[PDB]
Write a protein that binds this ligand. Structure first.
Ligand SMILES: [Cl-]
Length: 293
């Protein structure tokens, strides 16, 4: 069934003094499609989606700094750090116009970049994306107590850094179907050493929940306001019950956002790519054929 391999030849580019790894496949010409993963994944999360798009479009899938095969500088790994590295990655590859395919923290990066570079975005496909979570009641009940505990320097660092709970617990709890041992080993590989787990803990502490942190909430509100008035073509994938995006929120956005098509992938939590990669990939390819790219 769902592929477990990661066949892609490694590419690296140096930005801000550090190497970022990326997948780069597909034809060399045309408008490239840039795939941005989130927490606690890597370009591995796109492995079964890219092959539907790569016949006809260049596919670029970087690993965020400190994640995947990318370098591990001694950083706080705040969202702001990821913004600087991704801004530099995009420019270092000489990308001009792009289509974005974005998920989780990759979607905050993608939307924030699109807001600041709107002339260069030809379309955005997005799923299980960062939006303001106004209260803890709007976080899924099944995941509420653990995410509240993650957002502390005592229990949260014990769980995420020392016990590897984000990889061993939260990740499988973000996929409806069972992950195999081989898939788990691909997700574990960047984080075998606890000293390398800072991004896994800082990311949930950056999530915009109940107004906190104020700076992230403001930045996310700004890109959501931009998205609501942007003519950019939009493709929204969602599942039931979801995690960041409940079905009601997907339906609300499908109506409120200009030029937006929405696609139900079936059962899904956070890593929709792991529950229905073939629908996501095939639908991205079909939608791309309708764009002026
Ligand atoms: Cl997170």
């Amino acid at each position: 069934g769902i592929g477990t391999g990661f066949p892609f030849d490694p590419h690296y580019v140096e930005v801000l003094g550090e190497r970022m790894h990326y997948v780069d496949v597909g034809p060399r010409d045309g408008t490239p499609v840039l795939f941005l993963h989130g927490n606690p994944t890597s370009s591995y999360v796109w492995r079964n989606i890219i092959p539907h798009v790569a016949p006809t479009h260049r596919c670029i899938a970087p690993d965020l700094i400190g994640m995947g095969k990318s370098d591990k500088p001694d950083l706080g790994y705040f969202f702001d750090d990821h913004v600087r590295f991704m801004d530099a990655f995009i420019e270092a590859l000489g990308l001009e116009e792009v289509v974005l395919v974005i998920h989780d923290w990759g979607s905050a990066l993608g939307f924030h970049w699109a807001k600041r570079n709107p002339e260069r975005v030809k379309g955005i496909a997005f799923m299980e994306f960062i939006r303001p979570i106004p209260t803890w009641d709007e976080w899924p009940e099944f995941a509420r107590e653990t995410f509240q505990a993650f957002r502390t320097t005592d229990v949260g660092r014990k769980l995420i850094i020392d016990w590897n709970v984000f990889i061993e617990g939260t990740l499988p709890m973000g996929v409806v179907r069972p992950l195999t041992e081989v898939e788990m080993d691909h997700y574990r590989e960047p984080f075998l050493n606890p000293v390398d787990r800072e991004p896994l803990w800082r990311f949930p502490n950056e999530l915009p929940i109940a107004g906190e942190p104020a700076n992230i909430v403001a930045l996310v509100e700004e890109y959501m306001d931009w998205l609501h008035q942007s003519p950019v073509p939009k493709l929204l994938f969602w599942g039931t019950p979801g995690v960041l995006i409940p079905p009601a929120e997907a339906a609300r956005l499908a109506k409120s956002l200009p030029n937006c098509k929405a696609v139900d992938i079936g059962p899904g939590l956070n890593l929709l790519q792991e529950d229905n990669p073939d629908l996501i990939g095939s639908e991205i390819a079909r939608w791309l054929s309708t764009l002026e790219i």
